[PDB]
């Protein structure tokens, strides 16, 4: 399993799991197969063998991967421990270093250490003297036999009184000690042997893998897959494609039981980023508004429509047919202001059909000038500000005519045809964030290495930089002003008397169709004008993500209260004030699929970081990982057919098919389904989607990271029922809804992880066969997703690991004649029926036996194969079975 | 120090594509790597060096420097991908170094925002030379890609 | 003493997995065969012949001694500790072995 895989040297590992026996005990493996090795020759080979190994103890700080200190000691010759397992070929040693075990040998079981190493279950140890035994007992440390002059180490070292009490007295100071072990070449047998480590230790800094390889993360997908494109620059690249499988190195040693696991990825796009952004709302005092204009409403896929808030310190406004309810109202400074919210329409409807709720307006403080909070209030004491409509006929002049101060102001509406939609399009620098969930128990400790999709079905936030200022003429009564967002965006000002203020806000949202509406990012100004001592206009501004949902647009977090001050003692003055502008958009969970392609966060124009963190126990991972995209075609590939292999019923047309995206879950009697949970990722409470052991679909409660958590109980189990067609097909079943949070070893349920809703696939993935002449089909109506349980191999070269993800799936089929015309039951033996699990059988008339066919089409499972590979004609791969013609 | 690309060769049929930057002053103990920033930037970027106990932080060695494509009609004139555009081309969290004590670091970039804005195609509009650049204080030296194209 | 300029390799500062020793020549300035110790000095009178010429006597051992008695017999007591001295850890910046007392 995991490690990748380097040999010769020494890879090491934590006795760990759930129900983890004793944690601090530690196996050292070393492979010696360049000579091999008797039951006789063991004594001299394992007694040397130790006698080479060095054994050491590491110090840096306890997150790093750099450089600062070691020592080294050996292992004993005299009174050695020392062992061989034949079927593997490992010279192997134990040691137990952590309390209360440090001081003295313990009997380390031949079970929990067989999670490690196989072949020590299927034949026992041997010992010394070319005995065999099944025990292992370990070299107890204090009692080694050193190498300093030949001598013996002490009975109490630092390491021991450091592991004696680890719980805090490993953590030391500054540093953190980690035990460790090496190999100093020699030749015995008539051979050499030195190898390497990939992080995997008894304490193993949670960071991810770098070495031994010359790209950093391996992908086991990459290599096969026709291209031209690149001669010899390429020799550096590490990458991975959309939905298909980067496998991932979370290191990590420190958690006991179940070891729950959130994900943070970082994704952002190379190439320059213009973004279209949709007049959500406008806000804004009449004075501010011309005196007329034209509109009418853009629509909302969450279901909204865009508005225009009137600030109007008249009374009663008049827009439309409408008598209207303060949707706010203020005050300030003895002037009450109110907030009038209007869609428009062909209709004026009493009804709000949309709400805002906890609208959160800075302004600035009249002596201090640093922001004031406030949330406006309908005077039947509303923070769900009722989204009214005003409007009626098109073409037909409405005038919204509300009194700033108790001065008339107008803007009037000419009801619009059509939209004057006026989109944002501007340049701005983004970050886009992303999480997942798991909650992880395998057979791989320390070193949990699994395979995640580098395209979630669970939450994105989108938070990136741009630039606001405020540019305002300071006159000596009035002040004409404006302020600047988004980097076209902007909100304007007319006169603004002393003492007196004016307000504007906007709302942009990504102008689309699922993220429009459903996401939001408000900006609302107040503005004051006023003096002291020095003559001060002054702008104060929060700036809010929200999320209309259930119609209520719902803040999510405000963002920073920036106070801009514009002093001026000489009376005339225009100055500017800067503050940071966050565009932050925080979606909804699976808009991780679907806005994300709705943007094109993802392709062969994406650069991805990767971070990990442990749930409940709280543990983080300082080393950001990376990969990057280059997407290829699918190879493809079948295995042998003659003539001969249709004649005898023992004769057989074997097949093997690839394509490197059409696995999702590695490892034999793997399994798995979904939930989801406020885990903890970071400093917080991500909503993950938490992946979960089992065929067993779950249904946890509670707040998540604590103990407040506890798991509930099965769902639903998933069940491939054996049906009872022609030679029993196999097919899959359950509660089928839950397929959407079904993926098993099986590639044909791989496909519905994301790209579904509600157990009904969007994405087709799996392999997709169809007959002719006599036609029947696979996966398909005629014989349901998952028609038989299938499972991979031994993985790729690609891998460099054993007994992991590859799509080559193995199957057998016959085609026949001499069975034709035959009826289990009356379901009529004559067309293509699978023979249960791997098997298949193939039936044809008693002519068409020759020029009978069938026809494979592997079917991607990760969409994004599809992207500048597509002109290949190998995106989905394409390949056949046949009959020869012979005379 | 030097940027390079081991392809002077470089077929098309390509959006994305890495090099090399040799640049033995800025090894280091795996893993490192950098955050590319403002202009590119070279915010060296490794919690992951220890030097006795010390957990380390941005160090500011440098940026891309630009992206050029060739214009000759007697006089030799360039352009410029401007600095908006390289804090999205380059804005990547890690790159990280491929083997330790020596530089090595990979990026791999687009030619999809490439293709779109310097008017490249597959070999439609093509044909140039087309080099990267970088610059660093690392060894306070313009370090320059070498790729040249044929026009497939 | 004579010496010339000899620097020292760019790669031992690059990565700590490499890292120097410098070795300085100065002849006089060496005290005491004991690498591995740690001691104090006192000053007693050291009988000789017809007198006792006083002088600093070393005594092993990290502690400050305090020595009673006349200096020169088998008869003579060595003393112990005034204040110990002790390479602690003044913590902060990277951890030293900076003696304290």
């Given at each position: 399993?995991?490690?990748?895989?380097?040999?010769?040297?020494?890879?090491?590992?934590?006795?760990?799991?759930?129900?983890?026996?004793?944690?601090?005990?530690?196996?050292?493996?070393?492979?010696?197969?360049?000579?091999?090795?008797?039951?006789?020759?063991?004594?001299?080979?394992?007694?040397?063998?130790?006698?080479?190994?060095?054994?050491?103890?590491?110090?840096?700080?306890?997150?790093?991967?750099?450089?600062?200190?070691?020592?080294?000691?050996?292992?004993?010759?005299?009174?050695?421990?020392?062992?061989?397992?034949?079927?593997?070929?490992?010279?192997?040693?134990?040691?137990?270093?952590?309390?209360?075990?440090?001081?003295?040998?313990?009997?380390?079981?031949?079970?929990?250490?067989?999670?490690?190493?196989?072949?020590?279950?299927?034949?026992?140890?041997?010992?010394?003297?070319?005995?065999?035994?099944?025990?292992?007992?370990?070299?107890?440390?204090?009692?080694?036999?050193?190498?300093?002059?030949?001598?013996?180490?002490?009975?109490?070292?630092?390491?021991?009184?450091?592991?004696?009490?680890?719980?805090?007295?490993?953590?030391?100071?500054?540093?953190?000690?980690?035990?460790?072990?090496?190999?100093?070449?020699?030749?015995?047998?008539?051979?050499?042997?030195?190898?390497?480590?990939?992080?995997?230790?008894?304490?193993?800094?949670?960071?991810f893998?770098?070495?031994?390889?010359?790209a950093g993360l391996?992908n086991?997908m990459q290599?096969?897959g026709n291209l031209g494109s690149l001669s010899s620059e390429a020799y550096y690249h590490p990458v991975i494609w959309g939905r298909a499988l980067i496998?991932?190195?979370?290191?990590?040693?420190?958690?006991?039981?179940?070891?729950?696991?959130?994900f943070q990825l970082n994704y952002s796009v190379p190439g320059p980023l213009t973004i279209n952004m949709a007049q959500?709302?406008?806000?804004?005092?009449?004075?501010?508004?011309?005196?007329?204009?034209?509109?009418?409403?853009?629509?909302?896929?969450?279901?909204?429509?865009?508005?225009?808030?009137?600030?109007?310190?008249?009374?009663?406004?008049?827009?439309?047919?409408?008598?209207?309810?303060?949707?706010?109202?203020?005050?300030?400074?003895?002037?009450?202001?109110?907030?009038?919210?209007?869609?428009?329409?062909?209709?004026?409807?009493?009804?709000?059909?949309?709400?805002?709720?906890?609208?959160?307006?800075?302004?600035?403080?009249?002596?201090?000038?640093?922001?004031?909070?406030?949330?406006?209030?309908?005077?039947?004491?509303?923070?769900?500000?009722?989204?009214?409509?005003?409007?009626?006929?098109?073409?037909?002049?409405?005038?919204?005519?509300?009194?700033?101060?108790?001065?008339?102001?107008?803007?009037?509406?000419?009801?619009?045809?059509?939209?004057?939609?006026t989109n944002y399009v501007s340049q701005i620098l983004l970050k886009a964030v992303a999480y997942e969930?798991?909650?992880?128990?395998?057979?791989?400790?320390?070193?949990?290495?699994?395979?995640i999709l580098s395209t979630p079905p669970?939450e994105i936030s989108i938070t990136g930089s741009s630039t606001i200022?405020?540019?305002?003429?300071?006159?000596?009564?009035?002040?004409?002003?404006?302020?600047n967002l988004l980097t076209n965006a902007?909100?304007?000002?007319?006169?603004?008397?002393?003492?007196?203020?004016?307000?504007?806000?906007?709302?942009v949202t990504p102008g689309y169709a699922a993220i429009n509406?459903t996401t939001?990012m408000?900006?609302?100004?107040?503005?004051?004008?006023?003096?002291?001592?020095?003559?001060?206009?002054?702008?104060?501004?929060?700036?809010?993500p929200?999320?209309?949902?259930?119609?209520?647009?719902?803040?999510?977090?405000?963002?920073?209260?920036?106070?801009?001050?514009?002093?001026?003692?000489?009376?005339?003055?225009?100055?500017?004030?800067?503050?940071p502008l966050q565009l932050e958009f925080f979606t909804?969970?699976s808009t991780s699929y679907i806005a994300l392609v709705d943007f094109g966060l993802w392709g062969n124009l994406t650069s991805v970081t990767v971070s990990?963190?442990?749930?409940?126990?709280?543990?983080?991972?300082?080393?950001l990982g990376y990969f990057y995209g280059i997407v290829i075609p699918?190879?493809?590939?079948?295995?042998?057919?003659?003539?001969?292999?249709?004649?005898?019923?023992?004769?057989?047309?074997?097949?093997?098919?690839?394509?490197?995206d059409?696995?999702?879950?590695?490892?034999?009697?793997?399994?798995?389904?979904?939930?989801?949970?406020?885990?903890?990722?970071?400093?917080?409470?991500?909503?993950?989607?938490?992946?979960?052991?089992?065929?067993?679909?779950?249904?946890?409660?509670?707040?998540?990271?604590?103990?407040?958590?506890?798991?509930?109980?099965?769902?639903?189990?998933?069940?491939?029922?054996?049906?009872?067609?022609?030679?029993?097909?196999?097919?899959?079943?359950?509660?089928?809804?839950?397929?959407?949070?079904?993926?098993?070893?099986?590639?044909?349920?791989?496909?519905?992880?994301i790209q579904?809703?509600?157990?009904?696939?969007?994405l087709?993935?799996?392999?997709?066969?169809?007959?002719?002449?006599?036609?029947?089909?696979?996966?398909?109506?005629?014989?349901?997703?998952?028609?038989?349980?299938?499972?991979?191999?031994?993985?790729?070269?690609?891998?460099?690991?054993?007994?992991?993800?590859?799509?080559?799936?193995?199957?057998?089929?016959?085609?026949?004649?001499?069975?034709?015309?035959?009826?289990?039951?009356?379901?009529?033996?004559?067309?293509?029926?699978?023979?249960?699990?791997?098997?298949?059988?193939?039936?044809?008339?008693?002519?068409?036996?020759?020029?009978?066919?069938?026809?494979?089409?592997?079917?991607t499972?990760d969409y994004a194969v599809l992207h500048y590979f597509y002109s290949t004609?190998?995106y989905?791969?394409?390949?056949?079975?046949?009959?020869?013609?012979?005379? | 120090?030097?940027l390079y690309f081991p392809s002077s060769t470089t077929p098309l049929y390509q959006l994305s594509v890495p090099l090399y930057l040799?640049e033995?002053?800025?090894?280091?103990?795996?893993?490192?790597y950098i955050g590319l920033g403002t202009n590119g930037t070279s915010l060296w970027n490794?919690?992951?060096?220890?030097?006795?106990?010390?957990?380390?932080?941005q160090?500011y060695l440098g940026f891309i420097k630009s992206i050029s494509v060739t214009l000759?009609?007697?006089?030799?004139v360039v352009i410029p991908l401007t600095t908006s555009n390289m804090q999205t081309l380059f804005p990547q969290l890690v790159g990280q170094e491929l083997?330790?004590?020596?530089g090595t670091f990979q990026f791999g970039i687009s030619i999809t925002g490439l293709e779109k804005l310097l008017n490249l195609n597959v070999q439609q509009l093509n044909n140039s030379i087309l080099s990267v650049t970088y610059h660093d204080?690392?060894?306070?030296?313009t370090l320059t890609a070498t790729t040249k194209l044929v026009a497939l």
């Amino acid at each position: 399993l995991t490690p990748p895989v380097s040999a010769g040297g020494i890879q090491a590992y934590l006795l760990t799991g759930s129900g983890a026996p004793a944690s601090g005990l530690v196996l050292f493996v070393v492979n010696v197969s360049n000579i091999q090795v008797s039951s006789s020759n063991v004594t001299n080979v394992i007694s040397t063998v130790v006698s080479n190994i060095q054994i050491n103890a590491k110090t840096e700080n306890a997150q790093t991967g750099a450089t600062t200190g070691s020592v080294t000691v050996r292992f004993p010759t005299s009174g050695y421990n020392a062992y061989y397992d034949s079927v593997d070929k490992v010279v192997f040693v134990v040691v137990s270093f952590l309390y209360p075990y440090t001081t003295t040998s313990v009997n380390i079981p031949l079970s929990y250490l067989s999670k490690y190493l196989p072949g020590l279950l299927t034949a026992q140890p041997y010992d010394e003297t070319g005995a065999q035994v099944t025990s292992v007992s370990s070299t107890p440390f204090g009692s080694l036999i050193d190498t300093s002059t030949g001598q013996q180490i002490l009975g109490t070292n630092p390491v021991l009184t450091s592991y004696n009490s680890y719980t805090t007295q490993a953590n030391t100071n500054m540093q953190e000690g980690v035990v460790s072990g090496t190999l100093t070449s020699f030749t015995l047998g008539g051979q050499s042997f030195s190898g390497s480590t990939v992080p995997v230790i008894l304490y193993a800094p949670f960071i991810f893998s770098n070495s031994p390889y010359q790209a950093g993360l391996y992908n086991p997908m990459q290599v096969n897959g026709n291209l031209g494109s690149l001669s010899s620059e390429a020799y550096y690249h590490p990458v991975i494609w959309g939905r298909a499988l980067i496998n991932t190195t979370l290191i990590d040693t420190y958690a006991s039981g179940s070891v729950p696991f959130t994900f943070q990825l970082n994704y952002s796009v190379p190439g320059p980023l213009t973004i279209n952004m949709a007049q959500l709302a406008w806000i804004a005092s009449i004075n501010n508004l011309p005196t007329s204009f034209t509109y009418l409403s853009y629509k909302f896929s969450n279901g909204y429509e865009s508005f225009l808030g009137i600030i109007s310190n008249s009374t009663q406004l008049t827009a439309g047919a409408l008598t209207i309810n303060p949707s706010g109202n203020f005050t300030i400074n003895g002037k009450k202001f109110y907030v009038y919210l209007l869609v428009v329409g062909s209709t004026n409807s009493t009804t709000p059909v949309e709400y805002v709720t906890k609208l959160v307006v800075e302004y600035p403080s009249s002596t201090n000038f640093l922001p004031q909070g406030v949330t406006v209030t309908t005077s039947s004491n509303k923070y769900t500000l009722p989204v009214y409509e005003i409007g009626g006929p098109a073409g037909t002049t409405i005038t919204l005519t509300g009194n700033w101060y108790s001065t008339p102001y107008t803007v009037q509406i000419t009801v619009g045809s059509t939209p004057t939609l006026t989109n944002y399009v501007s340049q701005i620098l983004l970050k886009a964030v992303a999480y997942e969930g798991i909650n992880v128990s395998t057979t791989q400790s320390p070193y949990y290495s699994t395979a995640i999709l580098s395209t979630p079905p669970s939450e994105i936030s989108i938070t990136g930089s741009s630039t606001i200022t405020a540019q305002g003429k300071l006159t000596a009564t009035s002040a004409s002003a404006t302020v600047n967002l988004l980097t076209n965006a902007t909100l304007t000002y007319e006169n603004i008397p002393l003492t007196q203020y004016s307000f504007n806000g906007i709302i942009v949202t990504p102008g689309y169709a699922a993220i429009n509406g459903t996401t939001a990012m408000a900006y609302v100004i107040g503005a004051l004008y006023n003096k002291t001592s020095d003559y001060v206009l002054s702008f104060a501004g929060s700036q809010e993500p929200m999320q209309v949902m259930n119609n209520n647009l719902t803040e999510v977090t405000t963002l920073a209260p920036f106070g801009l001050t514009l002093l001026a003692p000489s009376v005339p003055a225009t100055e500017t004030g800067t503050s940071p502008l966050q565009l932050e958009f925080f979606t909804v969970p699976s808009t991780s699929y679907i806005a994300l392609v709705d943007f094109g966060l993802w392709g062969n124009l994406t650069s991805v970081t990767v971070s990990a963190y442990d749930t409940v126990n709280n543990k983080l991972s300082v080393n950001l990982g990376y990969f990057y995209g280059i997407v290829i075609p699918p190879s493809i590939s079948t295995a042998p057919y003659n003539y001969q292999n249709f004649i005898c019923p023992n004769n057989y047309v074997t097949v093997t098919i690839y394509d490197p995206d059409a696995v999702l879950d590695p490892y034999p009697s793997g399994s798995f389904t979904t939930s989801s949970l406020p885990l903890k990722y970071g400093n917080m409470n991500i909503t993950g989607a938490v992946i979960f052991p089992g065929s067993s679909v779950y249904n946890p409660s509670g707040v998540f990271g604590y103990s407040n958590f506890n798991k509930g109980a099965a769902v639903t189990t998933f069940t491939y029922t054996a049906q009872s067609g022609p030679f029993s097909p196999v097919a899959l079943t359950g509660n089928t809804n839950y397929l959407s949070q079904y993926a098993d070893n099986n590639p044909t349920d791989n496909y519905y992880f994301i790209q579904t809703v509600n157990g009904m696939p969007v994405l087709m993935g799996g392999l997709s066969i169809v007959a002719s002449p006599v036609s029947a089909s696979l996966p398909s109506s005629t014989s349901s997703p998952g028609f038989m349980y299938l499972l991979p191999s031994a993985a790729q070269v690609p891998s460099p690991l054993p007994g992991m993800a590859t799509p080559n799936y193995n199957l057998n089929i016959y085609i026949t004649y001499k069975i034709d015309g035959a009826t289990v039951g009356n379901n009529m033996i004559n067309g293509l029926y699978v023979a249960s699990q791997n098997t298949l059988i193939y039936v044809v008339p008693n002519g068409s036996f020759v020029g009978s066919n069938i026809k494979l089409t592997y079917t991607t499972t990760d969409y994004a194969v599809l992207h500048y590979f597509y002109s290949t004609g190998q995106y989905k791969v394409f390949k056949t079975v046949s009959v020869p013609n012979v005379t | 120090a030097n940027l390079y690309f081991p392809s002077s060769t470089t077929p098309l049929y390509q959006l994305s594509v890495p090099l090399y930057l040799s640049e033995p002053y800025y090894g280091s103990p795996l893993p490192t790597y950098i955050g590319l920033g403002t202009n590119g930037t070279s915010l060296w970027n490794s919690p992951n060096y220890v030097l006795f106990g010390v957990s380390a932080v941005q160090q500011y060695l440098g940026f891309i420097k630009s992206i050029s494509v060739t214009l000759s009609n007697g006089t030799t004139v360039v352009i410029p991908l401007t600095t908006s555009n390289m804090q999205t081309l380059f804005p990547q969290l890690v790159g990280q170094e491929l083997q330790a004590c020596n530089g090595t670091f990979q990026f791999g970039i687009s030619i999809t925002g490439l293709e779109k804005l310097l008017n490249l195609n597959v070999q439609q509009l093509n044909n140039s030379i087309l080099s990267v650049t970088y610059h660093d204080y690392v060894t306070g030296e313009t370090l320059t890609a070498t790729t040249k194209l044929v026009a497939l």
